[PDB]
Subunit: 366 residues, 2 copies
């Protein structure tokens, strides 16, 4: 099972020898006693290669080599006439010319394979241009498909955000994001205000597809309690737990860390609980920013609480995994000093001016 | 600039001649003194094609040296001698052989472009097999990402979907979704309000895709956010107006159809306003279809939504989301004459429509059933 050939020589003796040798090399041999019929055979079916010896009167000679090139059928053609006919062959479009009589049978083989190689080379090479084009025109199509997804995901992501600046009885809230990260704060029983800064791992629509569920996690818990609720006092530590076990329940493949805190206004007391891995929160009293003690992945299923009294005037704020200030060791000791330098107005001044681009999101609680 | 050819011809007069001819035909001619000149030059320059006279120039040995450097550079042999010699050269990969004085001007240039082409093809395709492989690797990776993104797409609905079958004071709600692997836009949700009013609705996002999934989440984010905004409290017909102006504000460009219905259990009545409906009550007797004064898709900024019936003891409603099953072709309206009979056979039971269900779908199907 190999490339088929077509021999056209007047000599039945010579045509007899070459055919056996070629067919012995797995090359299907088509024998053409007379030049004319060798042309008809090509019309019905197209062999991979055509060998022939220019002779007269039976053999067409140049007439044959012309027609094949004019019939839009391009196949290698080896000719076996002297220079006058050999030189022309190459001009008309012949692969190569071989002398007679050749005693070494192999010499014809090599010249035969060069033609096949440089023929199959043009067929495949031209196919790569069509297949590759077909690939990119199917890839760039799904790329623009992803872009429409990135945009769609961002729109619904910006919609879940709280109103800015929304302030309740002297408590101004301001969040600026520039996107898996999300920050929301909705009042509870009026007296208790809850806020958080979720920082979903990863990026893209999938990441923003986790944050959309997150709000559903938190919103539902409040909704789950029928006004009175299961309990009288809302608990931050258990809130992060519901979210936790829920992210395992559903194979999102993303771990989320968020700083949740409920501020009771009647008792002026704040109960918060660090999700696990975030740039520490910055409290702002006496003009000197102070870090708040905080502690995992938030993605475990095992069967803490930070309570603090608050002054009338304070400033508290969160970051979404954004370090621009010398890593880890000093990347946590420098932030505290910078925050007091200027809240929303100061950080804002520092923010931007970088084309580099997890996205950065900050919440200001004044 | 077309190509960089290297000629190694001992004969000054002749070599200069070839230089002028080739140079004119948009070529750079590098004249090599002798066999070694070309060899020392070749290593640094790496020309596209080398043409040298077979006189003794090292001759065949030079070709052997070029084959050793693993270069694919073609080699045209000029053996003007009327002799066994030329063939051995081609044996080493030499392109062709021209017999001097080779007065013929055209032939030489004919054998030159050939080799440069049969080489440019071997380079172009070898570069095509690399870009193609890189394209497929990058393509299949994005599909794997999309698949993973689609998996996360249908897994988010698990928490949002209501419990089935959830029944309150005699009313049984049941919904079963049959996804065709690919995400669908249809999303159904029913919720209780004031414990004295019950609302149910079926939505469907145009076509299918990841974007559609994002639209299904904002619907539950809209229908519920208007709930805690303020015993019939308000009317869905007015609600569809609010949800409409919200969707057109997002600029998503996704078309959503909804089948709303609020029930007052104290008075046993139903107020339904269906936007993209195009509402079947079993009645226990002859199957009846609900009438909606306004059936607008929701795309037009202007809201022309209107609502409209005391519920019977043995109630029996159903909502289908763009689910079309032949029976001739019976498309559209023809399809719509046939289903009333089928629902009756199904006896308004989610289960009986379920048994006919199942058994490749363009869009996943989601239905809601009410039993009383």
């Amino acid at each position: 099972v190999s490339a088929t050939l077509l021999i056209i020589d007047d000599d039945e003796v010579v045509r007899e020898s070459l055919a056996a040798y070629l067919e012995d090399s797995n090359f299907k041999v088509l024998q053409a006693l007379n030049g004319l019929q060798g042309l008809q055979i090509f019309e019905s079916e197209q062999p991979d290669l055509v060998i022939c010896d220019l002779r007269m009167p039976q053999i067409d000679g140049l007439e044959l080599i012309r027609r094949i090139r004019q019939t839009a059928s391009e196949t290698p053609i080896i000719v076996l006439g002297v220079m006058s006919d050999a030189v022309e062959a190459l001009r008309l479009g012949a692969a190569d010319y071989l002398i007679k009589p050749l005693e070494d049978l192999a010499v014809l083989e090599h010249s035969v394979r060069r033609a096949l190689d440089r023929a199959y080379l043009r067929v495949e090479n031209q196919r790569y241009r069509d297949k590759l084009e077909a690939a990119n025109r199917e890839l760039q199509a799904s790329l623009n498909l992803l872009q429409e997804d990135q945009n769609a995901g961002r729109q619904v992501q910006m919609n879940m955000l709280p109103v800015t600046p929304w302030s309740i009885e002297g408590l101004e809230f301001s969040h600026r994001i520039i996107s898996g990260d999300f920050v929301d704060y909705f009042r509870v029983d009026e007296r208790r205000v809850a806020f958080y800064l979720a920082d979903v791992s990863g990026h893209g629509a999938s990441s923003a597809f986790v944050t959309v569920l997150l709000k559903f996690m938190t919103t539902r818990l409040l909704y789950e309690s029928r006004r009175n609720g299961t309990l009288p006092e809302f608990k931050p530590s258990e809130v992060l737990a519901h979210i936790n076990r829920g992210l395992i329940n559903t194979k999102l493949g993303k771990h989320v860390t968020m700083l949740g805190g409920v501020i009771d206004l009647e008792k002026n007391s704040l109960t918060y609980s660090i999700g696990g891995h975030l740039p520490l929160p910055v409290l702002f009293v006496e003009g000197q920013a102070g870090y708040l003690e905080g502690r995992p992945v938030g993605l475990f299923d095992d069967a803490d609480d930070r309570v603090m009294e608050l002054p009338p005037s304070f400033s508290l704020s969160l970051f979404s995994d954004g370090i621009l200030d010398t890593l880890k060791e000093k990347e946590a000791s420098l932030p505290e000093q910078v925050a007091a330098a200027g809240l929303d107005g100061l950080r804002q001044v520092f923010g931007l001016a970088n084309l580099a681009e997890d996205d950065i999101a900050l919440l200001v609680l004044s």
